[PDB]
């Protein structure tokens, strides 16, 4: 199939889903495509945004810190049930695409940007597994190991192949193909540590942490040098950079679980995430220039994971300065989801513009 | 204004302040320029060299180790007072340049090498703040927080903008623009930790350490790969490389303050700094080939900060081998300052060659 | 002498010892060269493979874990004596080459790949020093310091020059010259820590660890970016990549010695090494496609050092899952040595093809 050199020279845009002014495609543009062909793999971001909020709201209802508010536990029950409904629908609809349009899927699997989104279905399931409502699992001492193996099996199996082609001469190297959204494949390992520690296997959790950190360091520095991938890193500051915060925030939570309390290895990761958050939200150009797009839902994923981590920090350092920080980050992140949630409905049933023709999968081979 | 691609293709030299044999300038060469236009931003290195010695001499007079010598405390009093006099003069003179020659300053602010020297004024003030003579501050329990905020405010505010343009598509990236003297912008955070810990705020000090380390790692590796910046890294070994030692040495001192005693996180940073020091001074080509230049004063900054760190190491591991190391590094560094101090006076009033025409700010736009 | 730009444009092959289909050489091909000229520096891999096995077998005979097997100590005595015999022969034969063919040696010293093999003679001696049979050294409390200085002297002295030319403008930089086998120069420091800790000097061991880690991180990331060195990184997966495991495995053992027990700093390094091992041996393409070559002996070096580290891990976490892992890795690594040992003899006296003409040292200057 087409390489990424032909995917970086015909598609331009921060997410790279936009045809340039010279390229030619193989399908009619004005004509309406079949619904299945117009269903991109970027719709899984909806599950990521909703699932993360379920984890965050549980912390506000069970954590010893932030207790005076008296947050009822029904928020997690309502959010968790609704989140699962969407996941069972997007996954079911996508499967039909593979059976009837397996040819189109292979095009996305080679897309430089959409490759890393294949991990979303497994990551989303993990969040709903480590934040199950207390009502459904009363007297829960330790989760059965089967949950970890089933959901951490397919991820790890596909983990080896992608990670193994970065140190090679094949075209798909970390240098030839890379982008700000490349962290989505290295965040599962950190998130998987929490699930493992909740089933009884503690040594295994340490294994995932080492794997996650080693690749994150490589994937972090590589996005500061001159890499063949051009037109992907947006000029100035763009929301696509929010994925930088997903990794450090998740890593900090993992350490607090295996080793019980914040060591020097938990605060430092948290402080790195906080620095990036300030440099991406403490700007008057962030709350003024906003355009609704499907990719936005995926950008709330790292702005909500930080809120979960910050609450844990406030638990080990009680005080007014810490409470304000924890109770303010969780408000900005939750506010964005509410705005996005209302906006999506209007574009679905009022304007009918959520699923336009996907011109990024119709680039002709060669020139 | 001119970019750095036009600043890396018309200026050649280790510090990059020297016109090539083909470029044309916009100002007369033989004619003497106004004094203000001939006052470069590189003169702030004088304050850095003198201020650091004040910190080092205090350690030799208060530290439990190195006590048999019976070093009087008057050395700090004399050095500290003289250091402040120079700072109040260079800063005052430079300010007049901005009012009358703000146009010239903007040229320096875009210079690939002189950009990182804007942090010197704030870093110099910190050294004189964490090494105040005991006489002036008797019964000193903890410094007022106002000192940290006032001096760490302007640095952090300008910290976000430069650090934020490295991960972007703008011309000023860590790859397009970089050089051995790029560590001067990542050393303030480590130095700022010491000041914060001396006013009562200890958690804040941890925040700066994480920020400092994250950027240092990125700025360390990036100077080993092939980066568009050419003609800046001198062939063979050059004194400009001494800035590599400023970062690790300052970081080690910070850890000893927040966490009290040398953990594994303090010795390892110290040993990295020691290795670089040996590879840059254990050479017969270092003490034989010496040419007086203004940039030399800034090269003593990292050769004196190590002496402060080594004394702390000798405090936790008493013994003859440690005492010799601490009492020998502080002698080489102090000897260079004395030689430079005498040499500067001769070039100021005997030869009158300290401030020649600055041809590096007269490069014509384009070709 | 010839640079590496002329060594990367006339030699092609995973180890780079194979002339391309267009280059011209300066010596007859059909004619048989003198035996000395046909003796490459790659023969030292034999000592590395045999010496490592001596260390591993000692652990199986003294370590509290893996005791039920009742492994006799005579295995170490027989292997150690035989290993020393080979070392005293290869070293003696090579020395004669320098006296009579010093001109040829300089060509190898500038070879991009064969430069890092000059460290083998010193590394091999260390293994036979930290694994001396108990019979030869009864009532051994601490080894004399002279052993460390004699064997760690020449390595460190040559350590400074190579490490010092990576951060420079000279042709031999980490970017212009690099390859998967570049870890052989950064593994001595980690191995040298164990020897130092066995003579009484413990603080010195910490110094080597910091030096080893700092260069390994630089040498690790640099092999993921686009570096002028092309045709050296084999396409797909190749055994040359096994050198990635030598560094982390050796580092983990060092920490367990200086600080007594596995901290968080030992398990994490071990887990990184384990991940790389799985991605290079858990493949049906590894045990099926095998071709005998001299470079193979050097590839068993990192597959045996891991077995030594894993046994130590099983000592701190007793249990059936740990015992199986330790007793299975040491079987695959030892099996390969037995297969290679038998194969080498046949190619030496039955087929007579171990030392063919070395065409890689006859590349004409320029084109
Ligand atoms: C990969 C780059 C972009 C930075 C982000 C990765 C972090 C996970 C790394 C960077 C440095 C590492 C730290 C290096 C120094 C220390 C201090 C060290 O201090 C202690 O002595 C622990 C016990 C204590 O005194 O509390 C604990 C480990 C830790 C935090 C390390 C944990 C992991 C850190 C934060
Ligand atoms: C960025 C690159 C060029 C290296 C320089 C950065 C250092 C600040 C990093 C590199 C590795 C880190 C270390 C990784 C391993 C350890 C060992 C670890 O050992 C312990 O178990 C601490 C308690 C003890 O046993 O003393 C303490 C943290 C520390 C020193 C880390 C502190 C920070 C270090 C030295
Ligand atoms: C260079 C890249 C490719 C990774 C391989 C280098 C490792 C040697 C570095 C990476 C991160 C470092 C670790 C960063 C975080 C920690 C956790 C920290 O946890 C503790 O709090 C120690 C005490 C304890 O709780 O057991 C101990 C140091 C350690 C293991 C560091 C040791 C050295 C590590 C494993
Ligand atoms: Cl949680
Ligand atoms: Cl001090
Ligand atoms: Cl051992």
Author numbering:
A (entry chain C), B (entry chain B), C (entry chain A): 150 to 516
Provide the authors' own sentences about this structure as they appear in the paper.
Moderately conductive AtSLAC1 6D mutant adopted both the open and closed conformations. In contrast, the closed conformation of AtSLAC1 6D was observed in the conditions of a higher sample concentration and dense particle distribution. In order to achieve better resolution from homogeneous population, we selected two datasets showing mostly open conformation to determine the open state and a dataset featuring a large proportion of the closed conformation to determine the closed state structure with C3 symmetry, both at resolution of 3.3 Å. The closed structure of AtSLAC1 6D was well aligned with that of phospho-defective AtSLAC1 S59A31 with Cα r.m.s.d. being only 0.45 Å. AtSLAC1 6D open state was modeled with the TMD region (residues 182-318, 329-506) except the faint density of intracellular loop 2 (ICL2) (residues 319–328), and closed state was modeled with the TMD and an intracellular plug (residues 150-516). In the closed structure, the ICL2 lies down on the membrane plane, which hereinafter we call as “bent state”. Consistent with previous studies, in the closed structure, the long narrow constriction from the intracellular pore entry to the central gate is formed by hydrophobic residues such as F266, L333 and M392. The radii throughout these constrictions are narrower than radius of a chloride ion, which make it impossible for a chloride ion to pass through. In the closed structure of AtSLAC1 6D, F276 on TM3 adopts an unfavorable rotameric state (−83° of χ1, 6° of χ2) in a manner similar to those in the previously reported structures, F285 of BdSLAC1 (−91° of χ1, −16° of χ2) and F276 of AtSLAC1 S59A (−86° of χ1, −22° of χ2). In the closed structure, constriction of the central gate is caused by two sites: a triad of V272, V336 and F450 on the intracellular side (hereinafter called as “triad constriction”), and a quad of F276, V336, V340 and F450 in the center (hereinafter called as “quad constriction”).
